[PDB]
Amino acid sequence: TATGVAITGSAPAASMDATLPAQLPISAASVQSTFTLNLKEIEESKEQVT
Amino acid sequence: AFSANGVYTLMRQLAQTSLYVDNFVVGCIPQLQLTTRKNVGVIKNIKV
Amino acid sequence: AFSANGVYTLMRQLAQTSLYVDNFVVGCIPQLQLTTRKNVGVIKNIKV
Amino acid sequence: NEELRNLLEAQMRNAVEEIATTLNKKLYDGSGAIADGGLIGLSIAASGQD
Amino acid sequence: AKLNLAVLNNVFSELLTQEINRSATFLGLLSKYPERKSNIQWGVGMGGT
Amino acid sequence: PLVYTPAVRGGANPASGSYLLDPQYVNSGVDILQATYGYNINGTANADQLLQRDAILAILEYALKDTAFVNAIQAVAAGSGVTTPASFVSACVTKLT
Amino acid sequence: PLVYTPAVRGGANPASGSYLLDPQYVNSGVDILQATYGYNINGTANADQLLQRDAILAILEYALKDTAFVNAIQAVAAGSGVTTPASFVSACVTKLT
Numbered sequence: 001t002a003t004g005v006a007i008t009g010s011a012p013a014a015s016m017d018a019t020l021p022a023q024l025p026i027s028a029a030s031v032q033s034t035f036t037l038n039l040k041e042i043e044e045s046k047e048q049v050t
Numbered sequence: 051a052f053s054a055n056g057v058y059t060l061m062r063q064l065a066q067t068s069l070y071v072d073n074f075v076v077g078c079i080p081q082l083q084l085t086t087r088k089n090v091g092v093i094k095n096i097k098v
Numbered sequence: 099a100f101s102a103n104g105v106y107t108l109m110r111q112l113a114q115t116s117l118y119v120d121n122f123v124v125g126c127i128p129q130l131q132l133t134t135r136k137n138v139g140v141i142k143n144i145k146v
Numbered sequence: 147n148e149e150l151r152n153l154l155e156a157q158m159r160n161a162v163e164e165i166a167t168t169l170n171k172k173l174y175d176g177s178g179a180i181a182d183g184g185l186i187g188l189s190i191a192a193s194g195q196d
Numbered sequence: 197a198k199l200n201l202a203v204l205n206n207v208f209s210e211l212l213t214q215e216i217n218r219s220a221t222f223l224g225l226l227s228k229y230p231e232r233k234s235n236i237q238w239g240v241g242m243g244g245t
Numbered sequence: 246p247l248v249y250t251p252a253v254r255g256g257a258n259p260a261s262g263s264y265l266l267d268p269q270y271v272n273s274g275v276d277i278l279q280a281t282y283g284y285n286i287n288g289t290a291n292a293d294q295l296l297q298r299d300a301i302l303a304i305l306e307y308a309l310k311d312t313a314f315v316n317a318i319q320a321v322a323a324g325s326g327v328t329t330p331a332s333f334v335s336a337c338v339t340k341l342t
Numbered sequence: 343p344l345v346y347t348p349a350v351r352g353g354a355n356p357a358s359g360s361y362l363l364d365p366q367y368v369n370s371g372v373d374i375l376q377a378t379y380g381y382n383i384n385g386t387a388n389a390d391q392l393l394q395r396d397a398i399l400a401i402l403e404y405a406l407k408d409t410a411f412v413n414a415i416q417a418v419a420a421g422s423g424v425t426t427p428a429s430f431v432s433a434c435v436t437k438l439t
Contacts, residue, residue, distance in 0.1 A: 025256030056228035
């Protein structure tokens with residue numbers, strides 16, 4: 001703050017500035033996927049599909 | 051009073067009474083001054 | 099703060115109001131710190 | 147801390163030293179059971195029970 | 197029972213965001229002057245002849 | 246029955262267990278709190294402590310921020326037998342029963 | 343009338359106003375808090391908010407550590423209609439008055 005006193009005044013009241021946190025958490029979850037393909041399908045798809 | 055953007059401000063760190071305090075101050079002494087209210091035009095209350 | 103026997107103390111001559119006065123101070127700021135109370139033994143309440 | 151920094155390497159040396167200190171504790175209390183680790187121990191080696 | 201659940205520490209980062217608006221536009225163009233007197237006096241001339 | 250979820254938005258249940266509380270302004274004005282909450286350190290579950298931890302976070306995320314709860318716990322502390330606050334916390338339990 | 347001191351031993355009224363709480367083990371078992379408490383950051387405390395600060399620090403130090411207060415706040419949460427815990431705190435403020 002900045003207030004106005006007289007020239008022969010008496011030094012007005014105290015005031016400082018301020019900061020604040022944010023803390024923004026991330027560490028719980030994930031985005032995942034599976035697909036579970038077979039081992040015999042990867043041979044009968046090289047001479048089956050054009 | 052030094053230089054602060056053309057406004058003369060004076061520091062003067064104050065006195066001290068306890069062992070652990072500093073208790074500064076800073077201030078200036080201003081005035082605006084308009085000559086010849088002839089060039090001056092105002093418009094009042096607009097819807098805003 | 100100087101280092102009298104490793105303990106840091108601060109001088110701080112205070113501000114004076116009358117003409118013939120000085121009004122000094124002196125002080126420090128301590129803390130003791132024991133880790134790991136494993137090596138420690140006490141023999142409380144001897145006849146004395 | 148440097149030890150708590152690498153979390154696998156700290157618990158690696160922390161489990162071997164638990165195997166080592168639970169093993170001599172069973173050298174005095176061994177009974178041959180699976181919960182006693184299979185050790186026989188001095189509880190019945192330093193007395194006559196067969 | 198985690199072995200560093202109470203030794204991990206919370207450290208900020210150099211990202212101070214200026215949020216408050218403390219601007220000075222009209223003060224910035226008034227062509228400042230150092231008047232070291234008690235009061236400013238000048239002359240205003242009306243008519244009459 | 247009560248269906249409380251951790252009110253900290255992105256990160257209700259963490260991997261480490263250091264569930265970092267969000268900072269909250271406690272007197273409805275002037276102070277700030279900034280807690281954490283480390284999970285299981287002397288056991289795991291007990292199947293009862295999951296309901297008591299379901300109420301510790303409720304009295305700490307929401308209640309101290311509230312302005313009507315704190316004026317109630319202000320009124321209990323002004324009683325005629327409330328000093329040396331092991332009697333403060335015992336004269337509020339009998340209010341809650 | 344309540345008489346009270348900050349419970350951490352050598353750190354009662356700090357210089358910077360960051361009153362670091364000493365950690366308590368809250369669920370009678372398995373958890374930990376490690377909170378702090380910032381002093382006046384949005385003004386001052388104007389002679390009534392000292393009394394609210396007198397009771398928030400008592401409910402945060404000597405109450406969450408206790409085993410009969412966390413069991414007294416457990417039984418309110420298992421009541422009737424105490425869901426969505428902005429009503430858990432409003433069903434607790436009716437017991438304290």
